[PDB]
């Protein structure tokens, strides 16, 4: 059955926390664990980081933490580094079900010369490698939380939520789905449909696949799960199989759900959105509908939720 969580007073706030800690006086949190999420054939390393905030930096699902990596702003001598934002991949109770930790899902940004393939560590991403290089007991400068675009609408506990992720864009949806299915939250009993679409390079690049597959067996009437493995599968048109191609496979069901009030969420690569728009336009055209008019209505009805970078 569902996992007991504490403390219940995390359900009492009527508004999400915002900017509890600011860049000039961050919260000094402590690393609990860092682990790789991926196998040896993944094109890059993605890690799962558990951070002890001690209850001092609570958040709601869908929000982000800021991390200030150590060192000096290169474009501003004497200044600290700029904040980098990370979508929180845990529920408000965290991976230890106690309200004391939050988790991040972090892709290592690594530079390769585009002609020779030669790596250059000096051009690697600062914060992402700082995080995935961290060890238990290391300190992390935390800011935030921030963000409201990806808060989960809970007014209707039987709503439908269609979740479209590329890579580490899966992060908020891990939190959504643990709250919907894993945790014993008496004041949110989800009875709708949650449908996760996840695009990653290959099987070794899957993120939290065991957890999501377990929801298929535990909640077969409330959860659906489809994967697009871009370097292991090809789409109808001959391109790499992307999430937009998986959406097209279920176009009629998805459009019916949207017409019925479903929420739809997009998180991950900003580059996926032009392809998704192109696919949805083509689907609409085949149905004899205008995607522009449909998208305008979805935005007006607050059904359309995008956070990409
Ligand atoms: C709201 C929101 C939420 C999230 C994210 C963004 C936003 C806006 N991101 C992205 C994250 O904030 C951050 O941008 C990345 O982790 C990269 O930051 P670094 O500090 O590692 O790279 P840094 O900012 O240092 O560098 C940026 C890029 O430039 C490259 N670069 C540096 N010097 C170069 C040079 N001389 N020539 C060419 N290239 C060079 C780096 O290799 C890197 O790819 C994210 N990410 C994630 O993995 N998980 C998440 O959950 C989220 N969540
Ligand atoms: N809240 C947020 O805004 C938020 C949260 C988390 C992450 N992000 C951003 O999302 C990024 C996710 O990157 P990642 O490194 O984890 O993923 P990645 O491995 O670069 O890509 C994930 C999958 O998306 C595919 N893809 C590439 N181009 C695409 C396109 N135009 N349309 C559809 N799919 C496409 C990739 O295929 P190929 O590589 O085979 O082309 C891969 O299969 C992060 O780097 C971060 O910048 C943003
Ligand atoms: Mg794996």
Cβ partners under 8 Å of residue 49, min gap 6: 31, 33, 34, 103, 104, 106, 131, 132, 134
Residue 106 counted as an annotated binding residue: no
Task: Decide if 3 is inside a domain.
Answer: no
Could you tell me which of 16, 158, 4 has the C-alpha nearest to residue 88? 16
Residue 128 counted as an annotated binding residue: yes
Task: Decide if 80 is inside a domain.
Answer: yes
CA of 107 relative to ligand 3 center, distance in Å: 15
Residue nearest to ligand 1 atom 9, measured at CA: 86
Residue 267 counted as an annotated binding residue: no
Pocket test for ligand 2, best of 63, 65, 269 (most atoms within 8 A of CB): 269
CA distance 3 to 11: 16
Does the CB atom of residue 123 touch ligand 1 within 6 A? Answer: yes
Residue nearest to ligand 1 atom 31, measured at CA: 123
Residue 4 counted as an annotated binding residue: no
CA of 163 relative to ligand 2 center, distance in Å: 15
Residue 126 counted as an annotated binding residue: yes
Q: Residue 88: nearest ligand to its CA?
A: 1
Domain count for the chain, please give it. Answer: 2
Residue nearest to ligand 1 atom 15, measured at CA: 128
Q: Residue 165: nearest ligand to its CA?
A: 2
Do 302 and 258 reside in the same domain of the chain? yes
Do 186 and 83 reside in the same domain of the chain? no
Concatenating the DSSP letter of every residue in the chain gives -PBP-S-GGGG--SS----SBBTTB-EEEEEEEEEE-S-TTSSS-EEEEEEE-TTSS---TT-EEEEE-SSB-TTSTTSBPPPEEEEB-S-TTTTTTSSSEEEEEEE----B-TTT--B-GGGS-HHHHHHHT--TT-EEEEEEEE--TT----SSTT-EEEEEEEGGGGHHHHHHHIIIIIB--TT----SEEEEEEEESSGGG-SSHHHHHHHHHH-TTTEEEEEEETTT-B-TTSSB--HHHHHHHTHHHHHHHHHTT-EEEEEE-TTHHHHHHHHHHHHHHHHT--HHHHHHHHHHTT-EEEEE-
Of 146, 162, 185, which closes a domain? 146
Q: Residue 268: nearest ligand to its CA?
A: 2
Of 123, 146, 169, which closes a domain? 146
Question: Which tokens go with 121?
Answer: 């560590």
Do 35 and 46 reside in the same domain of the chain? yes
Task: Decide if 141 is inside a domain.
Answer: yes
CA distance 104 to 49: 5
Do 136 and 204 reside in the same domain of the chain? no
Please provide residue 201's backbone torsions phi and psi, each rounded to the nearest 5 degrees. -65, -45
Does the CB atom of residue 270 touch ligand 1 within 6 A? Answer: no
Q: How was this structure determined?
A: X-ray
Is-contact 43 232, C-beta < 8 A?
A: no
Please provide residue 55's backbone torsions phi and psi, each rounded to the nearest 5 degrees. 85, 0
Do 137 and 166 reside in the same domain of the chain? no
CATH number at residue 57: 2.40.30.10
CATH number at residue 263: 3.40.50.80
Task: Decide if 135 is inside a domain.
Answer: yes
Please provide residue 148's backbone torsions phi and psi, each rounded to the nearest 5 degrees. -130, -10
As a whole number of angstroms, the longest Cα–Cα distance in the chain is 59
Structural domain harbouring 273: 147-308
Of 103, 124, 146, which closes a domain? 146
CA of 205, closest atom in ligand 2: 19
Do 172 and 242 reside in the same domain of the chain? yes
CA distance 171 to 102: 12
């Amino acid at each position: 059955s569902k996992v007991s969580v504490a403390p219940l007073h995390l359900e009492s706030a009527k508004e999400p926390p915002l900017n509890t800690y600011k860049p000039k006086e961050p919260f000094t949190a402590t690393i609990v664990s860092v682990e790789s999420l991926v196998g040896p054939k993944a094109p890059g390393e993605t890690c799962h980081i558990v951070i002890d905030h001690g209850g001092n930096v609570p958040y709601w699902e869908g929000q982000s933490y800021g991390v200030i990596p150590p060192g000096e702003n290169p474009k501003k001598p004497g200044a600290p580094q700029n904040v980098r934002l990370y979508s929180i991949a845990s529920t408000r109770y965290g991976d230890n079900f106690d309200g004391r930790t939050g988790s991040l899902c972090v892709r290592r940004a690594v530079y390769y010369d585009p002609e020779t393939g030669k790596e250059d560590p000096s051009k690697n991403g600062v914060c992402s490698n700082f995080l995935c290089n961290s060890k238990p007991g290391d300190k992390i400068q935390l800011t935030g939380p921030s963000g409201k675009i990806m808060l989960l609408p809970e007014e209707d506990p039987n709503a439908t939520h269609i979740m479209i992720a590329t890579g580490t864009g899966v992060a908020p949806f891990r939190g959504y789905l643990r709250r919907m299915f894993m945790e014993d939250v008496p004041n949110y009993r989800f009875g709708g449909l949650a449908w996760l679409f996840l695009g990653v390079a290959n099987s070794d690049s899957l993120l939290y696949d065991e957890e999501f597959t377990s929801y298929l067996k535990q909640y077969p009437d409330n959860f659906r799960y489809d994967k697009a493995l871009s370097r292991e599968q090809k789409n109808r048109s001959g391109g790499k199989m992307y999430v937009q191609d998986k959406i097209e496979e279920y176009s009629d069901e998805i459009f019916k759900l949207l017409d019925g009030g479903a929420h739809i969420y997009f998180c991950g690569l900003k580059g996926m959105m032009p392809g998704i728009q192109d696919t949805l336009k083509k689907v609409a055209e085949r149905r004899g509908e205008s995607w522009d008019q449909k998208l305008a209505q979805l935005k007006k009805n607050k059904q359309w939720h995008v956070e990409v970078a």
